[PDB]
Design a protein around this ligand. Structure first.
Ligand SMILES: CC[C@H](C)[C@@H]([C@@H](CC(=O)N1CCC[C@H]1[C@H](OC)[C@@H](C)C(=O)N[C@H](C)[C@@H](O)c1ccccc1)OC)N(C)C(=O)[C@@H](NC(=O)[C@@H](NC)C(C)C)C(C)C
Ligand SMILES: Nc1nc2c(ncn2[C@@H]2O[C@H](COP(=O)(O)OP(=O)(O)OP(=O)(O)O)[C@@H](O)[C@H]2O)c(=O)[nH]1
Ligand SMILES: Nc1ncnc2c1ncn2[C@@H]1O[C@H](COP(=O)(O)OP(=O)(O)CP(=O)(O)O)[C@@H](O)[C@H]1O
Ligand SMILES: Nc1nc2c(ncn2[C@@H]2O[C@H](COP(=O)(O)OP(=O)(O)O)[C@@H](O)[C@H]2O)c(=O)[nH]1
Ligand SMILES: [Ca+2]
Ligand SMILES: [Mg+2]
Ligand SMILES: [Mg+2]
Ligand SMILES: [Mg+2]
Lengths: 331, 430, 54, 437
């Protein structure tokens, strides 16, 4: 009998994995502070990594990579891409970005911002968000730590509706640092016509709150890959795999391989896996841009069952065998 | 040379005490005449813990034999190992204690106790560095129970910084029909809670049930019962008697086993369970030893360990075996049943391994548990006590010796408090 | 990768390599503590012997 | 030449001391006899090895060492053992009954009765020094003597020898070989009281050593003997510079200067390679690049922790054997591109390197294979605070219920000392996190 503990009650993904593990009959759930576990489903913050892997006779596995926050915080990601030769100042799939502190790259941001105006200079400040062409306004918003990023002025727009979207991809990294891209992604769509001058933020919460047109084109402003691929074929004579997924797989690999020496648990006294949510924008030319990486993603409702089973099969039972939905991104 | 002084009182005390000395004398290669005739240096290395040396290289048990009637001690002196004991260490009266705690503690025992303390003092003075005392007695009679606890209190007064350890035999209606035993036992437990550091709860209920259920003895005798007791006493004193790392003296054992001073009542266990002369031919495997030593059926106290939680555990393995396999199996018990070990005492299970097996076995293991389930034993005694005491039944035997009912009420209250304190830590979370 | 302060002898050598630059209580007090603890032991023992005398 | 006195306290300190002094004798060519043919100066010397050995008129080389235990069995084995002629009886100090795994018993109850004797015996060794530079103190965290008596001794050394440096070699407790449930209590108590009195402390987690012996020496169930032979090799690596001609870490003060920028943050991580089984028939000898790279593997550290997720304040590489600077620098260059090595902002990114050409010595019939080159890395990394976090958590679990606390209060310790020690540890964890994150 394998044992596990649960230390993040607010996780929809690991609630299901937990339910699945119990249903096997070969896993038992311990009190959260019992140290004799095989598997820790950890808390989102200040996870006690230093206490893992010091239990005689237990192989111990945890569902986070220590250090993965470098990818999963806005400011850290910017710094990581600029200062990693593997990614470099010249990296063509990440929008121009600068770290700014209220009350730092401020000067450098202006230096290239002045370049922009003489002679398209819309940017976005991320922490509530503010999109503006006035540099002066953005800096004020920050003051009362943020990133300032070039706002994609020419998004790919879905028809009917003339509406923007973003793509979420789910990536599982196992204890061997195998990189697994889940088959199914989701498009988080705006239900409003994109207005050049609620309709700029594809956020699911924001759409539900502020959009009259929430849900008309698709269930809960979510378009899945089968439909989107069919749309790409009909409107643009191409495929999801060719126009977009090739780039997406390139970006995911680049990011995670960059960070591998720093966070790999290959020769460590405990082991890690982690589920990531990568978010992408695509522009008019079918170029894919990375927006951000989420270290603790939720999942789309109709994908929970399959994804979570996949986590158990690949990340957990691989280490603790009982008695594919993923594409392996080969290094 | 950290000496232990052994005292055995009353019938039960002297019966199991004498068997203890037979069993460990054989282990240490000492014959009934006190002559050493063993083949290993391991046997003599800490022999001074339990034996004095005489001239002619005679080894004499540091043992004092006490009773208020001569019968059992006459038996012992005429037994196989009768000659081994120091003749002046036989201290006895003629009156008997009539199964009456008050006679043992207050009247008959009081007339004899100074004589005993004189012998105790002579033994202690002879010690390079005395550790403390071990006492064998029953709680259900009069001498071992009443005079035994009187002795404990007087020894504590003269030796207040030494460890006091007892092997205390709890009464059961499965083995005795004497009606006053729950009174004697409750009065004694009151004394033990206050004045011992470590008490091994040897339950006649458990002993009888092992003999009847497991050993398939249809008519268990005291000989059969005491066979289990002497196996247990040998196992739990192994770390004191042979070279070793863990729990190698009485104080280090107490510091490992007793997290709160009143909770010092241990549930012993043993594997394999054998009857006298069963003489079995297959050695147990390390996994078998480990599974059986933790099994309810192998406990010498009639308490279900699954009804409580382990505060602390000591496990002792004896024989030639893989220490790697021992470690693995011990870890497996804890990791497989982690909920039964309190989580607020990290790493609370300690393991010792001794190369020398007990006589007749290639492999054996002894368990010492400080479990909150031991409350079941005290509850059993308390229920029997209250059934009589609510009607003040049989109290005249005690008030005739000068006792007041208040003393019974205080003893009962203290034991019920002990029960409640176990329950408290049973329900406690980290 | 700058090597500095190379020192050699028949037994071995030592050097430093830089990759990148930067960017109480008295004897008296002790004795008192040991005696205060001793007095607490003695007090606790005294209480026990008083209890046994009762 | 300036002398160093070693003090070995409790069972772990003594048995590790046995192993070390045996190794020192082999390395320097000193017989159990106490005789050293190679020492052409008879009866007195100014040599580097005289830092650790004094000389008699008859040419006996005597360890500048005191062994202290509150119980006599372990020091009795030194007295009757192989190296009995090496030490004179006044160096070997025993009591009758031990501290029963109880810090308070070791520090207050028994320590009060023997501290003046021990100090008088240390004083006698100090009187034979022309330039005593200080002390090396060996002890466990977990034992009652190792924890309790050591902290008393350290306080009194600060008083009697205020100018003198004090280094520790401390055994951190591990359940796989530990003998008391209360070892976390003793650990926190002794660290709290010793912290201001120690200039530099090398912690060795029995868990790390245990696993190295399992994994690399193929020992199924390591004994203290297996553990101590490996530890003595690490200790010898660290003290080699005091005992041999050299220009790095040549006196105790230089350890603090080189490894300890902040006085409370004085616990350098040791990492050692290679550890090879003497039973391995065929063995390929490892290059400078390979043994140096091995220094950045948690599997080879004296404490298991992850330096990728802390910062470095200092790093020293100590080589023994066939090693030249060009190969060290090439190895380092390469490792820096490959590995996560971040220094704090206010410290140069760099390594101090010492090379001693004599390969490590191994005890005949021991577990370790002879190798042509070895290295011990000493790094002051904030990652070692993982060990304090582990220990503090165990402490918190027990202390919340006051489990076993009555044993300490019974020896005259006040309960308030527990929380005072724990507060100090909380502050220490806070210091590390500030420096490292
Ligand atoms: C279950 C309760 C005890 C155990 C048994 C046992 C007593 C015994 O063993 N006794 C009475 C001293 C003699 C001893 C045995 O002979 C029978 C010898 C061979 C012995 O075991 N001797 C051992 C080796 C010796 O060290 C020794 C130990 C203690 C005392 C004396 C002698 O006899 C079956 N008894 C009373 C009984 O079985 C009695 N039954 C009852 O009391 C029942 N109630 C009526 C219930 C309690 C079982 C019957 C005799 C009527
Ligand atoms: N590496 C190593 N650790 C040891 C050795 N002996 C004991 N230990 C460890 O030290 C701790 C126990 O402390 P000891 O040094 O035995 O105790 P002591 O200092 O003699 O103190 P008391 O015996 O309580 O007076 C446990 O963590 C043991 O695992 C040894 O020879 N080598
Ligand atoms: N540089 C940019 N250009 C164009 N649109 C952008 C952009 N940065 C962000 N957006 C839009 O803003 C929305 C939310 O951005 P972002 O992902 O930074 O917020 P968030 O991380 O808090 C929500 P989540 O964590 O689920 O991705 C995205 O759906 C995207 O449409
Ligand atoms: N296990 C065991 N129990 C005994 C033995 N002799 C008596 N008893 C039990 O001890 C209790 C009676 O006490 P006993 O020692 O005979 O009285 P004492 O002589 O006044 O101390 C009863 O519960 C008996 O069952 C024995 O040899 N072995
Ligand atoms: Ca000389
Ligand atoms: Mg986000
Ligand atoms: Mg009787
Ligand atoms: Mg000791």
């Amino acid at each position: 009998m394998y044992t596990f503990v649960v230390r993040d009650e607010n996780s929809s993904v690991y609630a299901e994995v937990s339910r699945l593990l119990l249903a096997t009959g070969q896993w038992k759930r311990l009190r959260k502070d019992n140290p004799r576990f095989n598997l820790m489903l950890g808390e989102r913050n200040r996870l006690p990594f230093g206490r893992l892997g010091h239990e005689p006779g237990l192989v111990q596995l945890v569902n986070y990579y220590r250090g993965a926050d470098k990818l999963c915080r806005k400011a850290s990601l910017v710094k990581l891409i600029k200062t990693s030769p593997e990614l470099s100042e010249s990296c063509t799939w990440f929008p121009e970005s600068y770290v700014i502190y209220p009350t730092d790259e401020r000067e450098v941001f202006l230096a290239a911002y002045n370049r922009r105006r003489e002679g398209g200079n819309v940017w976005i400040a991320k922490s509530g968000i503010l999109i503006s062409s006035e540099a002066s306004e953005l800096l004020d918003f920050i003051d009362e730590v943020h990133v300032i990023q070039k706002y994609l002025e020419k998004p790919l727009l879905l028809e009917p509706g003339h509406r923007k979207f973003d793509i979420r991809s789910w990536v599982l990294v196992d204890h061997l640092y195998n990189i697994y891209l889940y088959r199914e992604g989701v498009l988080r769509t705006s239900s409003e016509p994109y207005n050049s001058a609620t309709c700029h933020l594809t956020n699911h919460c924001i759409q539900k709150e502020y959009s009259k047109n929430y849900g008309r084109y698709e269930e809960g402003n979510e378009m899945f890959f089968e439909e989107f691929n069919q749309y790409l074929m009909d409107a643009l004579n191409t495929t999801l795999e060719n126009s977009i997924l090739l780039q997406i797989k390139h970006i995911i690999r680049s990011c995670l391989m960059c960070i591998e020496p720093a966070i790999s648990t290959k020769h460590l006294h405990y082991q890690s896996f982690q589920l990531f949510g990568f978010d992408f924008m695509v522009d008019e030319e079918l170029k894919v841009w990375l927006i951000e990486v989420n270290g603790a993603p939720a999942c789309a409702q109709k994908l929970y069952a399959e994804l979570c089973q996949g986590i158990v099969d690949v990340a957990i039972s691989s280490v603790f065998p009982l008695a594919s939905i993923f594409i392996k991104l080969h290094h | 040379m950290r000496e232990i002084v052994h005292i055995q009182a009353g019938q039960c005390g002297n019966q199991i005490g004498a068997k203890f000395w037979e069993v460990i004398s054989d282990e240490h290669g000492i014959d009934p005449t006190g002559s050493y005739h063993g083949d290993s240096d391991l046997q003599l290395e800490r022999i001074n813990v339990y034996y004095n040396e005489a001239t002619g290289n005679k080894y004499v048990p540091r043992a004092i034999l006490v009773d208020l009637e001569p019968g059992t001690m006459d038996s012992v002196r005429s037994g196989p190992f009768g000659q081994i004991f120091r003749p002046d260490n036989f201290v006895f009266g003629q009156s008997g204690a009539g199964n009456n705690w008050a006679k043992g503690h207050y009247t008959e025992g009081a007339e004899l106790v100074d004589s005993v303390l004189d012998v105790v003092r002579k033994e202690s003075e002879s010690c390079d560095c005395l550790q403390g005392f071990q006492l064998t007695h029953s709680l259900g009679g009069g001498t071992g129970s009443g005079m035994g606890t009187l002795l404990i209190s007087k020894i504590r007064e003269e030796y207040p910084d030494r460890i006091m350890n007892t092997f205390s035999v709890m009464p059961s209606p499965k083995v005795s029909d004497t009606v006053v035993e729950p009174y004697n036992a409750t009065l004694s437990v009151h004394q033990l809670v206050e004045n011992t550091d470590e008490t091994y709860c040897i339950d006649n209920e458990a002993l009888y049930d092992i003999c009847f259920r497991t050993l398939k003895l249809t008519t268990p005798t005291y000989g059969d019962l005491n066979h289990l007791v002497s196996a247990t006493m040998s196992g739990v004193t192994t770390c004191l008697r042979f070279p070793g790392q863990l729990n190698a003296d009485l104080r280090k054992l107490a510091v490992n086993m007793v997290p709160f001073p009143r909770l010092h009542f241990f549930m012993p266990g043993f594997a394999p369970l054998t009857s006298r002369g069963s003489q079995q031919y297959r050695a147990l495997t390390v996994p078998e030893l480990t599974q059986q030593m933790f099994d309810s059926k192998n406990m010498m106290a009639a308490c279900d360990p699954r009804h409580g939680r382990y505060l602390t555990v000591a496990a002792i393995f004896r024989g030639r075996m893989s220490m790697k396999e021992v470690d693995e199996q011990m870890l497996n018990v804890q990791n497989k049943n982690s909920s039964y070990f309190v989580e607020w005492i990290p790493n609370n299970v300690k393991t010792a391994v001794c190369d020398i097996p007990p006589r007749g076995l290639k492999m054996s293991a002894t368990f010492i548990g400080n479990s909150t389930a031991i409350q079941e034993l005290f509850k059993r005694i308390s229920e029997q006590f209250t059934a009589m005491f609510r009607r003040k039944a049989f109290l005249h035997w005690y008030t005739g010796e000068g006792m007041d009912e208040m003393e019974f009420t205080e003893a009962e209250s203290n034991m019920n408090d002990l029960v409640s304190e176990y329950q408290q830590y049973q329900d406690a979370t980290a | 990768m700058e090597v500095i302060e190379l020192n050699k002898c028949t037994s071995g050598q030592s050097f430093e390599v830089i990759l990148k630059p930067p960017s109480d209580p008295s004897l008296e007090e002790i004795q008192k503590k040991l005696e205060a603890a001793e007095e607490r032991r003695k007090y606790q023992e005294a209480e026990l012997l008083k209890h046994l005398a009762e | 030449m300036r002398e160093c006195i070693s003090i070995h306290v409790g069972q772990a300190g003594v048995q590790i001391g046995n192993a070390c002094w045996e190794l020192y004798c082999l390395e320097h060519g000193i017989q159990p006899d106490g005789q050293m043919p190679s020492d052409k100066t008879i009866g007195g010397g100014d040599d580097s090895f005289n830092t650790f050995f004094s000389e008699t008129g008859a040419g006996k080389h005597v360890p500048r060492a005191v062994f202290v235990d509150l119980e006599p069995t372990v020091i009795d084995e030194v007295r009757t053992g192989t190296y009995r002629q090496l030490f004179h009886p006044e160096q070997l100090i025993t009591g009758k009954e031990d501290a029963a795994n109880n810090y308070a018993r070791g520090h207050y109850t028994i320590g009060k009765e023997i501290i003046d004797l021990v100090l008088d015996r240390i004083r006698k060794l100090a009187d034979q020094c022309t330039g005593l530079q200080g002390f090396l103190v060996f002890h466990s965290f977990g034992g009652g003597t190792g924890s309790g008596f050591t902290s008393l001794l350290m306080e009194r050394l600060s008083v009697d020898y205020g100018k003198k440096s004090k280094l520790e070699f401390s055994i951190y407790p591990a359940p796989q070989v530990s003998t008391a449930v209360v070892e976390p209590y003793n650990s926190i108590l002794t660290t709290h009281t010793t912290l201001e009195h120690s200039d530099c402390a090398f912690m060795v987690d029995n868990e790390a050593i245990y696993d190295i012996c399992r994994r690399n020496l193929d020992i199924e169930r390591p004994t203290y003997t297996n553990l101590n032979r490996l530890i003595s090799q690490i200790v010898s690596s660290i003290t080699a510079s005091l005992r041999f001609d050299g220009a790095l870490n040549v006196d105790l003060t230089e350890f603090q200067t080189n490894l300890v920028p902040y006085p409370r943050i004085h616990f350098p991580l040791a990492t050692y390679a290679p550890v090879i089984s003497a039973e391995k028939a065929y063995h390929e000898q490892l290059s400078v690049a390979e043994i140096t790279n091995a220094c950045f593997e948690p599997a080879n550290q004296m404490v298991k922790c992850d330096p990728r997720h802390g910062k470095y304040m200092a790093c020293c590489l100590l080589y023994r054997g066939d090693v030249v600077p060009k190969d060290v620098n090439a190895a380092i260059a390469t490792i820096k591109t490959k590995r996560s090595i971040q220094f704090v902002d206010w410290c140069p990114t760099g390594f101090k390197v010492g090379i001693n050409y004599q390969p490590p010595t191994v005890v005949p019939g021991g577990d370790l294979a002879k190798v042509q080159r070895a290295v011990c890395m000493l790094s002051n990394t904030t990652a070692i605070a993982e060990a304090w976090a582990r220990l503090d958590h165990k402490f918190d679990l027990m202390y919340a219920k006051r489990a076993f606390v009555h044993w300490y209060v019974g020896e005259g310790m006040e309960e308030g000392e527990f929380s005072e020690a724990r507060e100090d540890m909380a502050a220490l964890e806070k210091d590390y996190e500030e420096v490292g994150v």
